[PDB]
């Protein structure tokens, strides 16, 4: 089992980037070797995309998975799941049904060696807040999660601000429970300052400053390194990357920053997202040292 023991922030990729390609031109192994070319070690997979025969893989497939991790020096970092209470059109799922589904994903994530879960929940308003019983769902799975060393993290992303209701309700919950197995995944779109002339921007979105993240880093277990555009000098032209990465270096972050690219040109013909990601990782390696 390969282990990556750089101190401080580490770089990785989220296979959501290979989204136009997966199952068409790249296989799961192609994605692993693509991360290898980059020197990237951390990975994020999506439960409903990258586990063959989900939700019940075979012992053969799981062992193939671990062989891939060893062969390409990949650390399972973050495992993206959904607790979809609204999966049924006619009714919500009871708290117990939601916990049974969550617990199941926690087991699979642990078996594949993951250590953070990026949990997405149905949303009930325009602040993107979770179903009202979310406290009850998470509290149902927290003992299993603590046993198996997993940390469940909802994702914070635009238009949500690092100091709006959504973040503080999660931080409040962590403090009241005292759990070290619930937390936050910050997606770098919350620091985005540059946009295109004529590009619509949610009137509710305000950029956060890189320092805005400092009081939350106690609760941040993994970050999506969102990025919009890489110059041919391998700089990111919409987010203060140097200042964000340095803030996190200086303030004790030891998690991963996983490349997430969501541009629509992903799906244009001829687009080579592997090249785009290599751009993003030239920047990331230069900022981190490895």
């Amino acid at each position: 089992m390969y282990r990556y023991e750089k101190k401080g922030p580490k770089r990785g990729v989220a296979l959501y980037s290979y989204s136009a390609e997966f199952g068409l031109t790249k296989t799961l192994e192609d994605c692993f070797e693509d991360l290898h070319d980059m020197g990237a070690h951390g990975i994020e997979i999506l439960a409903n995309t990258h586990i063959e025969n989900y939700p019940y893989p075979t012992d053969e497939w799981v062992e193939k998975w671990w062989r891939l991790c060893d062969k390409y020096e990949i650390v399972p970092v973050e495992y993206g799941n959904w607790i979809d209470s609204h999966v049924l059109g006619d009714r919500d799922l009871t708290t117990e049904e939601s916990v049974e589904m969550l617990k199941r994903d926690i087991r699979l994530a642990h078996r594949l060696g993951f250590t953070v879960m990026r949990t997405k929940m149905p949303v009930i308003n325009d602040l993107l807040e979770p179903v009202e019983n979310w406290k009850e769902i998470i509290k149902g799975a927290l003992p299993l999660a603590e046993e198996l060393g997993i940390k469940m993290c909802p994702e914070i992303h635009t238009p949500s601000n690092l100091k709006g209701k959504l973040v503080n309700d999660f931080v409040e919950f962590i403090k009241e429970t005292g759990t070290k197995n619930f937390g936050l995944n910050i997606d770098f779109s919350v620091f985005r300052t540059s946009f295109a002339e004529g590009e619509w921007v949610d009137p509710n979105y305000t950029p956060n400053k890189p320092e805005d993240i400092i009081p939350l880093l106690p609760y941040v277990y993994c970050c999506h390194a969102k990025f919009i555009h890489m110059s041919d000098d391998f700089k990111e032209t919409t987010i203060p990357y140097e200042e964000v990465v340095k803030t996190m270096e200086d303030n004790g972050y030891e998690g991963y920053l996983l490349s997430e690219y969501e541009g629509a040109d992903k799906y244009d013909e001829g687009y080579e997202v592997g090249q785009t990601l290599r751009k993003h990782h030239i920047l990331l390696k230069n900022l981190l040292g490895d």
Partner: protein, 151 residues
């Protein structure tokens, strides 16, 4: 498989046992970045050479098993994978004739984690206000050929 949503492979007429043509099938791939459970699916309306065919005439075959729209609306444990195109079987006595056929099919799926503007008015036969290609178009077309003798 193919980049187009309607697949060129698996488009054929369907026989009976007693040799009579009962309909035709074609495959659709999930144009999503993740799989969905059956109860998330919202089958829409088919058009074959302009002839309209309602969803009550079309079953979905996923994981070797045939489902009705009703069966599907209640099943939140069976999972459709992005790489395992569904087989839609269309009821139509006599099937399609020799030669070309223009297909227009619509369907979509629920994504309760999306902003609630987006999730509302989610019509399997009409495109979303703004288009995000990681979700695909609800409506897709394809011109495909049927092999049969001339009548």
């Amino acid at each position: 498989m193919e980049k187009q949503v309607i697949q060129s492979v698996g488009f054929r007429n369907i026989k009976n046992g007693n040799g009579e043509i009962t309909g035709f099938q074609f495959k659709v791939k999930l144009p999503y970045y993740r799989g969905v459970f059956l109860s998330q699916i919202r089958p829409g309306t088919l058009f074959v050479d302009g002839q309209k065919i309602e969803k009550d005439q079309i079953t979905w075959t996923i994981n070797g098993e045939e489902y009705t729209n009703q069966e599907m609306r209640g099943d939140f444990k069976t999972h459709w994978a992005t790489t395992k195109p569904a087989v839609l079987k269309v009821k139509m006595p006599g099937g399609l004739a020799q030669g070309y056929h223009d297909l227009k099919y619509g369907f979509c799926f629920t994504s309760s984690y999306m902003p609630p503007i987006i999730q509302d008015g989610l019509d399997p036969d009409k495109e979303s206000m703004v288009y995000m290609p990681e979700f695909g178009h609800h409506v897709n077309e394809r011109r495909l050929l049927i092999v049969k003798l001339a009548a």
